[PDB]
């Protein structure tokens, strides 16, 4: 019912179709807005 | 807005330039008009909040990093558009996607 980041999963390589989002969380020594520059995402099918 | 916020005045404080308008309208009219998803549009957030403060344009400020081994992109101290054309013109040949902040192996 109820750092931390969002990533979605798509479902090829095109990252045209999103399925969902998924909420991990970040490492001590990370940074989140180099996560979202460098186009970190999750694939279904590579 | 630069007009706005300037009544005819030959220099501001950095600090009451409109950063919050000027990102709000570029995020949400200008370039964030023909972006579509939401990670896109985060993405351009991410970017304008980075790039429009310049900690109040203050020195030593970082644009980007070239190599993750010691080299960055750091902010020209030029004020005139002659000085910032020359610093642009003094970047070196070699571009890696590490400028654009993707991964070198893209």
């Known amino acids: ?46 | 807005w630069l007009d706005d916020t300037a009544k005819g005045r030959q220099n501001i404080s950095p600090d009451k330039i409109p950063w919050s308008a000027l990102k709000t309208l570029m995020a949400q009219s200008i370039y964030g008009g023909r972006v579509d998803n939401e990670f896109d549009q985060r993405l351009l957030n991410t970017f304008l909040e980075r790039l429009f403060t310049t900690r109040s344009f203050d020195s030593e400020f970082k644009l980007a990093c070239k190599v993750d081994g010691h080299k960055d992109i750091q902010m020209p101290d030029g004020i005139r558009r002659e000085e910032f054309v020359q610093w642009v013109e003094l970047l070196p040949d070699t571009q890696t996607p590490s400028w654009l902040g993707l991964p070198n192996n893209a």
């Open chain 1, 1 to 46: 019912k109820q750092s931390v980041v969002t990533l979605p999963v798509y479902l090829n390589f095109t990252r045209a179709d999103l399925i969902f989002t998924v909420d991990f969380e970040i490492a001590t020594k990370e940074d989140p807005r180099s996560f979202y520059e460098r186009g970190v995402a999750v694939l279904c099918t590579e």
